[PDB]
Amino acid sequence: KDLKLGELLLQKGWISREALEEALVEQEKTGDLLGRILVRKGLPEEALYRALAEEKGLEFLESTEGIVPDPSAALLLLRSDALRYGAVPIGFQNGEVEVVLSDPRHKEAVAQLLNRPARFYLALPQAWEELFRRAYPQ
């Protein structure tokens, strides 16, 4: 009985009940992702990602600018896999690989593929792409 995205945003005070109902009513007609509807209707994208991070047990990263990606960690995923799964392995801490995700929905698929202890972070789209390109030059 974990909270869903809308319930989490409501509890955090970042959307109103009327805004949530409005987004759910549209989703019932369109099938769009709820967070995408809420951001279109005015929720800050960062508010969405903070809530998605909490929902999935990920640490939200406010910036990727200070990360120096460990080349040893990046070898654990082929570049094509890092891009498709939206996952950048950036280093190691106490025998866990640190991995920055672009989409919380991919956490399980990435964790299965890595098949080793890992610590997962979530970064905003622009921040993630900057990090990916530094870790995986083409």
Ligand SMILES: Nc1nc2c(ncn2[C@@H]2O[C@@H]3COP(=O)(O)O[C@H]4[C@@H](O)[C@H](n5cnc6c(=O)[nH]c(N)nc65)O[C@@H]4COP(=O)(O)O[C@H]3[C@H]2O)c(=O)[nH]1
């Ligand atoms: N990268 C990304 N991920 C997103 C986004 N929006 C939602 N998600 C994530 O994708 C899953 C599916 O969202 P959905 O298709 O809108 O399907 C959702 C939505 O239809 C719906 N629902 C979500 N929140 C609420 C709520 O507060 N009240 C009610 N009655 N239904 C909700 O339950 C379904 C499952 O919700 P969740 O457990 O929270 O699981 C969510 C959530 O983990 C987005 O914009 N970007």
